[model samples]
Target: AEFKHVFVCVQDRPPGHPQGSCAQRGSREVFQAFMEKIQTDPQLFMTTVITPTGCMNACMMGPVVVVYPDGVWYGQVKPEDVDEIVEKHLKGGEPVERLVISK
Candidate 1:
């Protein structure tokens, strides 16, 4: 089946780099949190994907996360926030208003 959502986490780069690294800021934990939550729902597991991606050139806002098909970008994400994103955005078809990054 075709994917309905693609979640990307900018997960790595050398720590202490000029741009900073999401890995240093806990994107790995954030990624794990997302995966843990996604796995609980069969429909979500089938229609959604989570990827640990490279530097997205916006490390000023470290731990950036992008959800596609919706084009929502969430910056400064903490592991505790993943559940809300999954619930409010992934399941509800509405972006989390407070977490969104305006382009």
Candidate 2:
């Protein structure tokens, strides 16, 4: 089955940054949690959870997640926020207002 949604983790740590990379900040853990959530949901048969990627051109943001088709960008994501991301954005088709990155 084709995936209905794709989540890319854009976690990067540049030199002299106060905080570490997103991978260090639990990006992988969040990704794993998201995958588990989706898997447990019988309705989410075609959804895919991916690994944290290289610099998504937004290194300053440290931890970031992007949802395709919608092109929604989420910054400073914590592991605890995975459920909201999956439930609201992935399942309900609504972007999480608090996590959205401002232009």
Candidate 3:
């Protein structure tokens, strides 16, 4: 009875690492925002899943968020971006075009 899967990159890298990392860019907090939104939205419980995941090789674009079923990928997310995503993509049936990543 599920409808969507959201994978948010919260990968942590050591301080000052060359390649950079998602969590270092505040992905962990972004992930939390998604979680909180989903948890409070009663309709989402039976239809959506929010997962905190490691890097999916989209590090330069930290705070990456991928939505399955729709197969949409968004990058450079922040805690504030979560609501627009939940509204436009998760509920409104349209991906947030501005935040979407081409890859």
Candidate 4:
């Protein structure tokens, strides 16, 4: 089956960033946690989790994740927050309002 949703974790680090990039900041681990959790749900059979192409242009926030098909952007994602992302946003069809990055 084709993917129903896609998540891109932007793990980019540009020069002069004080806190370093998301990839260096354990985005991979966060990504892995997300993947593991989602796999437990058979209903989420067609979702794809990916590392983004480059910096999402929001490195100041770091640890950014973008949920596609909805254009929802999340920032400063922590490991503990992964469950809410999967449960509320991915499964429940509701965006995790608290984690949204405002422009």
Query: How many residue pairs clash per model?
Result: 0, 0, 0, 0
Tell me the tens digit of each residue's lDDT in model 1 across 1-103.
3464545555566655787788888888998988888798886798788988888777778688888867888888899888888877887777778878842
**lDDT of model 2 at position 81:** 90
Better of 1 and 2 by lDDT: 1
lDDT of 4 by residue, 1-103 (tens): 3343545454656667786787776677777777777687776645655444466777667578887767788888887898898878787778889889942
- Candidates arranged by TM-score, highest first: 3, 1, 4, 2
Off by over 4 Å in 3: none
lDDT string for model 3 (1-103, tens) is 3499999988898888886998989999998898899888987766889998988998897778999988999999989999999988887778999889953
Candidate 4: which stretches are off by over 4 Å?
Answer: 1-4, 10-19, 47-52
Candidate 2 lDDT by residue in tens digits, 1-103: 3344556564646656665677766677777777788788866646654555765755456467887767788888887898887778787778899988842
Q: Whole-model lDDT for model 2 versus the true structure?
A: 0.70
Question: What TM-score would candidate 4 get against the native?
Answer: 0.77
Which runs of model 2 end up more than 4 angstroms from their true locations?
A: 1-3, 10-19, 48-51
Sort the predicted structures by lDDT, highest score first. 3, 1, 4, 2
Better of 1 and 2 by TM-score: 1
Candidate with more favorable, higher TM-score: 1 or 4: 1
Best candidate, TM-score-wise? 3
lDDT of candidate 2 at residue 67, scale 0 to 100: 75
